[PDB]
Design a protein around this ligand. Sequence first.
Ligand SMILES: *[C@@H]1O[C@H](CO)[C@@H](O[C@@H]2O[C@H](CO)[C@@H](O[C@@H]3O[C@H](CO[C@H]4O[C@H](CO[C@H]5O[C@H](CO)[C@@H](O)[C@H](O)[C@@H]5O)[C@@H](O)[C@H](O[C@H]5O[C@H](CO)[C@@H](O)[C@H](O)[C@@H]5O)[C@@H]4O)[C@@H](O)[C@H](O)[C@@H]3O)[C@H](O)[C@H]2NC(C)=O)[C@H](O)[C@H]1NC(C)=O
Ligand SMILES: *[C@@H]1O[C@H](CO)[C@@H](O[C@@H]2O[C@H](CO)[C@@H](O[C@@H]3O[C@H](CO[C@H]4O[C@H](CO[C@H]5O[C@H](CO)[C@@H](O)[C@H](O)[C@@H]5O)[C@@H](O)[C@H](O[C@H]5O[C@H](CO)[C@@H](O)[C@H](O)[C@@H]5O)[C@@H]4O)[C@@H](O)[C@H](O)[C@@H]3O)[C@H](O)[C@H]2NC(C)=O)[C@H](O)[C@H]1NC(C)=O
Ligand SMILES: *[C@@H]1O[C@H](CO)[C@@H](O[C@@H]2O[C@H](CO)[C@@H](O[C@@H]3O[C@H](CO[C@H]4O[C@H](CO[C@H]5O[C@H](CO)[C@@H](O)[C@H](O)[C@@H]5O)[C@@H](O)[C@H](O[C@H]5O[C@H](CO)[C@@H](O)[C@H](O)[C@@H]5O)[C@@H]4O)[C@@H](O)[C@H](O)[C@@H]3O)[C@H](O)[C@H]2NC(C)=O)[C@H](O)[C@H]1NC(C)=O
Ligand SMILES: *[C@@H]1O[C@H](CO)[C@@H](O[C@@H]2O[C@H](CO)[C@@H](O[C@@H]3O[C@H](CO[C@H]4O[C@H](CO[C@H]5O[C@H](CO)[C@@H](O)[C@H](O)[C@@H]5O)[C@@H](O)[C@H](O[C@H]5O[C@H](CO)[C@@H](O)[C@H](O)[C@@H]5O)[C@@H]4O)[C@@H](O)[C@H](O)[C@@H]3O)[C@H](O)[C@H]2NC(C)=O)[C@H](O)[C@H]1NC(C)=O
Ligand code: CA
Ligand code: CA
Ligand code: CA
Ligand code: CA
Lengths: 389, 389, 389, 389
Amino acid sequence: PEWTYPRLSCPGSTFQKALLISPHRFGETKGNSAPLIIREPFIACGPKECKHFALTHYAAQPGGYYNGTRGDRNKLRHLISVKLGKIPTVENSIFHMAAWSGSACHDGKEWTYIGVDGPDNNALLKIKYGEAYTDTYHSYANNILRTQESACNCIGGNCYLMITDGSASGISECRFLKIREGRIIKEIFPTGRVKHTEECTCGFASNKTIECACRDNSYTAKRPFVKLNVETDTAEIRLMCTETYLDTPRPDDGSITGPCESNGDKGSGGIKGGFVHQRMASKIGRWYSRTMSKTKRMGMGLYVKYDGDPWTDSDALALSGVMVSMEEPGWYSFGFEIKDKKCDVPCIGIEMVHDGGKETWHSAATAIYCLMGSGQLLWDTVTGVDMAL
Amino acid sequence: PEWTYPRLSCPGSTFQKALLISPHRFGETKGNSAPLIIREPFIACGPKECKHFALTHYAAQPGGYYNGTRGDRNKLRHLISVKLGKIPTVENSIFHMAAWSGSACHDGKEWTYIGVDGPDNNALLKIKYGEAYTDTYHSYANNILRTQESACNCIGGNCYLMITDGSASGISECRFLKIREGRIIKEIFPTGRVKHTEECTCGFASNKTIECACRDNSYTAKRPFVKLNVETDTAEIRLMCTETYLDTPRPDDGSITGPCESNGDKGSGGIKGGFVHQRMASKIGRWYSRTMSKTKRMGMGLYVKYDGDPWTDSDALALSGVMVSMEEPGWYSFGFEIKDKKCDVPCIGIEMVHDGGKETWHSAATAIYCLMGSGQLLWDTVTGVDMAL
Amino acid sequence: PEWTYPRLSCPGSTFQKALLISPHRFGETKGNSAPLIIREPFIACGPKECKHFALTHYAAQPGGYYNGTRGDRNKLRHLISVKLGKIPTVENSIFHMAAWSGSACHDGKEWTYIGVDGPDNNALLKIKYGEAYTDTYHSYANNILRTQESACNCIGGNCYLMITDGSASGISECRFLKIREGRIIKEIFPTGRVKHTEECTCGFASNKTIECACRDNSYTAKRPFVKLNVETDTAEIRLMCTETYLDTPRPDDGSITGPCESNGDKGSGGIKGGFVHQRMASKIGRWYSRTMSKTKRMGMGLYVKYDGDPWTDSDALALSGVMVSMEEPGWYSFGFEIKDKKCDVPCIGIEMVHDGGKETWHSAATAIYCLMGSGQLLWDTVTGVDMAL
Amino acid sequence: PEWTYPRLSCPGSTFQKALLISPHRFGETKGNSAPLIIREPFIACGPKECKHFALTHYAAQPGGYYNGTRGDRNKLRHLISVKLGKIPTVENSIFHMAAWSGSACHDGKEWTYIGVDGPDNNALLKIKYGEAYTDTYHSYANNILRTQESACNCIGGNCYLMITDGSASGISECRFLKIREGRIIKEIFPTGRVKHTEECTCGFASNKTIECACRDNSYTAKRPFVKLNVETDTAEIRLMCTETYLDTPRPDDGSITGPCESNGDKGSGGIKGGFVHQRMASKIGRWYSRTMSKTKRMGMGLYVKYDGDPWTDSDALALSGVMVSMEEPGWYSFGFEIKDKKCDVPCIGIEMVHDGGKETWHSAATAIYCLMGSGQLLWDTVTGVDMAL
Ligand SMILES: *[C@@H]1O[C@H](CO)[C@@H](O[C@@H]2O[C@H](CO)[C@@H](O[C@@H]3O[C@H](CO[C@H]4O[C@H](CO[C@H]5O[C@H](CO)[C@@H](O)[C@H](O)[C@@H]5O)[C@@H](O)[C@H](O[C@H]5O[C@H](CO)[C@@H](O)[C@H](O)[C@@H]5O)[C@@H]4O)[C@@H](O)[C@H](O)[C@@H]3O)[C@H](O)[C@H]2NC(C)=O)[C@H](O)[C@H]1NC(C)=O
Ligand SMILES: *[C@@H]1O[C@H](CO)[C@@H](O[C@@H]2O[C@H](CO)[C@@H](O[C@@H]3O[C@H](CO[C@H]4O[C@H](CO[C@H]5O[C@H](CO)[C@@H](O)[C@H](O)[C@@H]5O)[C@@H](O)[C@H](O[C@H]5O[C@H](CO)[C@@H](O)[C@H](O)[C@@H]5O)[C@@H]4O)[C@@H](O)[C@H](O)[C@@H]3O)[C@H](O)[C@H]2NC(C)=O)[C@H](O)[C@H]1NC(C)=O
Ligand SMILES: *[C@@H]1O[C@H](CO)[C@@H](O[C@@H]2O[C@H](CO)[C@@H](O[C@@H]3O[C@H](CO[C@H]4O[C@H](CO[C@H]5O[C@H](CO)[C@@H](O)[C@H](O)[C@@H]5O)[C@@H](O)[C@H](O[C@H]5O[C@H](CO)[C@@H](O)[C@H](O)[C@@H]5O)[C@@H]4O)[C@@H](O)[C@H](O)[C@@H]3O)[C@H](O)[C@H]2NC(C)=O)[C@H](O)[C@H]1NC(C)=O
Ligand SMILES: *[C@@H]1O[C@H](CO)[C@@H](O[C@@H]2O[C@H](CO)[C@@H](O[C@@H]3O[C@H](CO[C@H]4O[C@H](CO[C@H]5O[C@H](CO)[C@@H](O)[C@H](O)[C@@H]5O)[C@@H](O)[C@H](O[C@H]5O[C@H](CO)[C@@H](O)[C@H](O)[C@@H]5O)[C@@H]4O)[C@@H](O)[C@H](O)[C@@H]3O)[C@H](O)[C@H]2NC(C)=O)[C@H](O)[C@H]1NC(C)=O
Ligand SMILES: [Ca+2]
Ligand SMILES: [Ca+2]
Ligand SMILES: [Ca+2]
Ligand SMILES: [Ca+2]
């Protein structure tokens, strides 16, 4: 085969509901199935197939290992995948590696699978290229080394990946790695607004540039926004200037007072956010998602803006549609791209967590929406699960 | 590969029982299986494989989501498929897209998957070519935009598809779309008898012509009959003239008084009907199916006529055989064609619904019959399910 | 690819235990599995893969459809297959066609699947070549038209198959069909001892000749023995002359008084028997199996003789080994051949039925033995099932 | 394709936790899964895929066949495999052959599968090349003929395999077989320290030499160490001289008094041990594993030494890390190698048995660790199973 490159995007001007993967529809006590207990789902596509990835707790519903299934980190956690369209069950899924933080991508020839493992103070990023484990990367701040929980991005064979290390409540200065046939050939140290960046959702703006919309878990409700030049291997981060704050929790739109870089208030905590590019011949669409509630992980709206500089443009993003109603859960979101025959189709995934607290099972559905045709986004998504079944 | 074209049909002069897919044979409380709760099954074949499609309620038997499983439209409904011959279970099936109305076909190179989604007043036809979502089509009468629930038909790369929009009890003027590598490149507006046409079962009479036997849900028990010329992309509809009324409910054969186009009575409601072509060197066989009961969805007989014009020929269709006994359920039927090495094999599928009303589970089996050898059709089909197990 | 031909057999001079497929090891009430309820299992191999076939009752254990699972013929019965080595479960299996009698073979290019269906007085042989149903054959004695329940045999593209029609207690004069790309191109009418022949187990003695060891269900305990010349398409049947009577029930060896063709006594009823060829450069081995008990379907021994004419040679077959102990069930047996890189490996399968009578479940295991190395056959086979679990 | 050869090893200088396969995470009474009851797991990799092998008792958890599931040898035991990364369940697994002792390898073209079967006094080694059973080998000491329970090793098409025969408590003089396209073309009789050698874990030191670290079950806690020259087909065994005794049970390191060959005390019983090669341009790493407890099968540490002669070098192996804590079970270990694009990645597997005694179920998890990056080994492995669920 040949190395993948970003192409121009397929025709269209709205997103529509594509696909729901709700594995706990079949998790009943009175049923006969074994859906895997997961969180942090994401999707990544190669020239022939799309894979649906997740981090499992190594437990099924129904079952007896519900306890600890609300934590993030433990020695059983694993990166798993099914072909997108298959329900992620005990039998359908393939286990790639131990991990409580994850990424994966296809370079045109082969899959790269990334998983972070180990103790909180000395955790370890691990790289699998196909079947072969091929490299690692050590914790540099000794406080929960971490990666994206969404697809990495490859071009001409170089796959690019955000990592971060630091306190969830303080400084977490991310870096980027450049990975080629599964080995780290370069380290990139961003400049600019670097205080706290984690869970970057990234994609290609062009053959020169990768961008990402990230999460500040401590300081601000504005998403940190990465521009990485892949020709010089240099990166700069600044906050998104829009009044449409995309993190949760957040304050009311436009109420953060100051120039583009101000923080200011109700910006502790956060959430991973969907972000995807619509690349046209003389114009670029940036697509984003965020929660319907300003405070809780309920609902998910889709927004878009075409062109401008997100670092300096304070104008609202344009509401396109409600993807998940306020009455339904809306936790992490991510972007990804499907390869049609001659163009790329942008999409946004949504993690819909079934949360009853730590004294029952904790898992998620996944809702997908993608650019298709014209007009407005038309229908919303429900998980359909009753957690007591 | 290369684009598919209709060929001449394989030798034979009767249909025989081929294959039963009865997934609820394994749906017992005392069993360990997970058959998917479906309705509107259909089959479509490519150069190497046949796929068995259906619309699932995203629920299994045994299980706890039986409620609402008798409705047609909801936000969980999905187009799903297995390789024909596999039982459609939670694990075997692949989920293609959200949908409460469906079609699919293979053009020789790739699969096209069609699914209609959304609210009743502003629903949305969605097209997937392989992995990529590639186009849509908007509701034009704002009353339950709908498609065939059977295979679309491709030639030299153009795949043809009926849609319809309108009141189930009044006007539903269908159109046809011409789809190529998953994008709509033409709209066809039929002329002639257009009042109410839905659930068209279509196939190729030749390299010039596609025909379809459709359902009038309001006005008549005669099936509306489409002739679509694929060289000029034009279509005309008239009612079938035969005394052998193929819809259910219906009145006694030959009792509709008038010329070929009269309606007249007990023609409210309806059912999707099987229809398939037997193409010979200097002759054409048209194969049809209909319910044994004149009023209820019980039984299914197979009929045939060779040549003539169905628009103007009032003569009876020739009873070939009882495919499902009166004592067994017989709901939707469809036609399809399997590719043998140098010729096409015509077939008819039969949806056999397990119906106990809305206070239990609602799903279906699928019975297949195909042209094979000579003589008479020999055996009938039972689902073998006891719904209380 | 290219057409298959029989080659010379791989080196060796004993059979050994190869493989047990015991699906009811996982059929417990306290388990979570769904093994298919089958009988008449058999195996057939192509250039790349071996398929394990069976006739299912369309019911699993554990489950609620045990009743009728001891009969042979009904409208739910089906030919099913898994890759040999896989457990035949609801999900693993593929359903080929409705059938209560079965055969299948691979010609080098594609699989041919055969299934007999229909009413007792007017039953129907059906042929599937790959996905396509391609031909049939009508009942000629109107009394349970039937086929082999073991592999058919192809050469240069012509696949040969025994069928039979007639009373299980009287005359059942078999014929042979010659099938090519799934269509019957010739009918062969054997001559000689033709009174009663059914369930023929066949294979190639050479590029000219096919032989078979069959069952007489009415008249004799000597197996009828077919020699079919594939160059002239002619066939002759005579009884096996050996004192080692291979049917069950039978009388003590050598106690049938008379020349080679005498019947005489305790020859009602019968059983399908294993038979396979070991083809060498200047010598031919014939391998056979039979039940340890003279009267009941308990145990299974393996015997061999090299060269001679089975029609006229009254000498004992040479006991090679006990494949199933007297304490274990031993019902049908069959022969088959696995393709190694440059030679064919002969094998014998054994159906081991779990029989508690008609008021519980009725299914089978399958035990395989094959030519491998030298010396004596070393171990026997148990199903390991407790039917009350 | 082409024959496999050992290449130089991929860059790195530590092992890290790669992958846990814990099938009994889903074996609960309150679950819906069917993990196969196994022991003696091992892994073997070909140019495109890695297979995870094991010997099953032909029983699942949950289920009713727990009794006898703590013995080694019986007539139901089988060699089974899944693609590495898949959970070994009733449905996922493929059954290769009857066996209570096992090996397998890929020569670059095809898989060779080895299984020992039969009675204790006259057991039988059986070889399958692809689908074809192709050879055997007879018991030469009439006391539990046995093989490695780990991967065999192929080069230029010749695959090399240890076997052994003799009392578990006395003499068990092993030999090596040279197998090519599945037939034994040579027998190798080692010289030197031959009293007791079994369960050899082997790999290539080079294109000339294969080495193995074996088990003495009777006489000593020093692992017997095989050097086999593949150019002359000759082999010599001596004990490992290191003070770091690798068997269990064992005495305290360095406490066996004498020259390199002394036995002396607490050397009855034993365990199969992990061993794998790191081949560099001018240097060789030998990697080993052993149990944390000196007496019980609890924990598992990883050790390494670079260069020297293991026969004569008494120096300690270098502790690299704790792979399994003392509080967790640690039974058999093995080495294997994954093929990256241009180099080989060394790995060690660990069998973690769930042992509650013979009055419940007896099975195992499998933990994998592999050379990846630099620094120290960072995290340990737990099965996470509660055997009462
Ligand atoms: C990252 O860089 C990529 C490489 O630069 C870029 O890929 C290009 O994308 C554009 C989309 O705007 C495509 O241009 C379109 O071309 C089609 C017709 O396609 C045929 O013509 C092109 C060349 O025409 C143009 O370029 C030449 C110089 O190369 C000029 O002289 C001329 O002025 C034209 O503007 C030809 O190269 C194509 O060949 C490719 O595609 C075919 C079929 O798809 C393949 O079979 C073949 O292997 C090869 O890949 C093709 O025959 C036209 O209808 C449109 O109007 C438009 O001009 C290019 O095809 C494409 N180039 C290549 C080399 O693939 C990515 O878009 C860019 N990504 C991003 C996100 O910026
Ligand atoms: C839609 O249009 C299709 C294209 O027009 C049409 O396909 C044709 O179907 C007919 C069935 O009646 C086939 O004709 C049959 O031919 C076989 C022997 O096959 C060989 O001969 C043909 C050509 O012979 C005829 O046509 C030529 C002009 O083309 C005349 O001079 C002459 O008078 C003959 O009547 C040859 O083209 C075939 O080649 C095809 O098939 C081979 C093997 O199958 C392939 O390897 C090859 O790639 C190619 O596809 C072949 O060598 C004869 O025994 C029969 O009696 C009959 O005459 C045609 O093969 C076929 N044509 C093509 C180009 O495929 C579809 O039937 C039509 N569909 C419908 C529903 O109407
Ligand atoms: C059904 O008929 C088949 C065709 O007649 C027959 O197949 C033959 O089986 C015999 C087994 O005894 C094989 O003969 C063996 O040959 C190997 C070395 O193989 C190479 O040599 C042969 C030809 O040698 C003989 O024949 C020629 C005339 O053809 C004579 O002059 C000469 O005296 C020899 O006796 C050659 O054809 C082979 O080529 C085949 O095999 C190779 C590799 O396997 C393939 O790559 C190739 O495509 C082709 O298939 C080969 O190069 C020798 O070591 C043995 O001692 C033995 O003589 C034949 O190979 C084989 N013939 C063919 C054409 O395949 C079946 O056995 C028969 N079946 C039964 C049950 O009777
Ligand atoms: C078992 O034996 C194997 C065969 O002897 C041996 O394989 C060799 O392993 C070494 C690792 O040290 C490789 O050498 C490395 O080469 C790369 C660049 O690769 C290219 O160059 C080599 C030849 O260069 C050397 O040898 C020639 C004589 O052959 C000398 O004149 C010269 O002084 C050099 O030292 C060339 O053969 C390679 O071609 C192979 O690889 C390519 C791509 O991988 C394939 O496409 C091709 O089919 C072929 O397999 C290649 O173009 C260099 O960067 C390193 O510094 C190092 O020198 C060899 O490639 C490799 N040889 C072969 C024939 O594969 C195994 O290592 C040995 N195993 C063990 C455990 O001992
Ligand atoms: Ca925040
Ligand atoms: Ca009507
Ligand atoms: Ca008899
Ligand atoms: Ca010892």
